[PDB]
Amino acid sequence: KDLRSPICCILGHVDTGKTKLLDKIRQTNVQGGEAGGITQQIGATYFPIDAIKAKTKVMAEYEKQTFDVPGLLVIDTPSFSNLRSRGSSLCNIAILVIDIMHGLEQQTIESIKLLRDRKAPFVVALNKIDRLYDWKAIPNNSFRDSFAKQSRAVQEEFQSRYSKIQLELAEQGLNSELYFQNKNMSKYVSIVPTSAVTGEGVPDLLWLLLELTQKRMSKQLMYLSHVEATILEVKVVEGFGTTIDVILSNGYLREGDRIVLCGMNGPIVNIRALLTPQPLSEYVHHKEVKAALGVKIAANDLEKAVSGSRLLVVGPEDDEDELMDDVMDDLTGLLDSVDTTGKGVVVQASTLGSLEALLDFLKDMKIPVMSIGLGPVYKRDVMKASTMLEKAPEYAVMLCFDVKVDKEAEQYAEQEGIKIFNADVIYHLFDSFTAYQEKLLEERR
């Protein structure tokens, strides 16, 4: 069957060894040789199927192998992969990282709810097994071979910490099991013990990713001419100006293509350049690109482009206005969910998905929202909170999620009485906000 590469993503609490794990997955160096052809793309790293074979050679004695996909695509940055609205998904399968030395943490809890609300398929990487006392490492080994060669005390400690984490997941409404002991691969979460330091378990992880996607999600991997593209990030590049970084999940892109996307001031409508990184910052130019890959698009008027936006191509038969109204549905739908004349807090987020997640939580959690925005916070944005200084300074604050605040903007906010909360984590914004609300409640007199 004509399949394209599965797309996977990685997430989990901070300091769980996510980036380190990613680096281990990407290194050329494996047990007995090297994995060749591993290429850097825009926002993602690409693994041709031969590189996966090399990486999973040690897994062949423990499982049957399947190599029907052309390769594997991994998003390079650990929410950023959940940037579109809840309605769709570019990431085929997620990797939830759990620190075995700390178990379930609060940002793991958030991740799980996020994955659940999207019905995103995922596995967990039970990371940092090398931190178990007296663990003897065999670099880039399969988990089961290494585990069998451990002392008993080490195996006992693993079982103890693993069974506890297993109970924590069940408290979150998740049945989980070691991947090779899982009797229900679609309902029960598969656990893969890994080490970002040694590479142990990484072959298992890659084998599992290929297994779940090819055996249980082959329909999603079927290549189609229909264009599926989601804006990953908006970046200014010197000899191009403002560019957009997209993940092309299916279809073709051709330079010269007329494209429609969601913008902050309304819809945006031609591709000048299709760019990929040069490995020997400089880019390669392509007349056309085929899914699946991460690619950078150069075009005019991309300055106001929205992260999370779908990307549509205007064909011979399409009406541009209909296509423009289509992509704007996701952003516009968020606008009409807040009370603007009624008055509450200001909110700004990085993407459509993170904005939606924050808004739904805030409504769920009684906190009135007055205004919303996307991307980097400027003074213009914080001034929207000025209307809240006198009538109820309690709501004269900004809730910022995963966005940068300009020095210029944080200076101004403090000239006034505008408190700025900025976090990577929703419960952090909430905790900060309530504490501020409570600090005003013994401004008793």
Swiss-Prot record:
Residues 195-197 are annotated as: G5. K(+) binds at residues 15, 37. GTP binds at residues 15-20, 31, 37-39, 127-130, 196-197. Residues 127-130 are annotated as: G4. GO terms for biological process: cytosolic ribosome assembly; formation of cytoplasmic translation initiation complex; maturation of SSU-rRNA from tricistronic rRNA transcript (SSU-rRNA, 5.8S rRNA, LSU-rRNA); regulation of translational initiation; ribosome assembly; translational initiation. GO terms for cellular component: cytoplasm; cytoplasmic stress granule; cytosol; cytosolic small ribosomal subunit; eukaryotic 48S preinitiation complex; mitochondrion. Residues 3-218 form the tr-type G domain. Na(+) binds at residues 15, 37. Changing residue 39 to A: Impairs the GTPase activity, but not the ribosome joining function. Residues 12-19 are annotated as: G1. This is Eukaryotic translation initiation factor 5B. The lineage of its organism: Eukaryota, Fungi, Dikarya, Ascomycota, Saccharomycotina. The gene is FUN12.
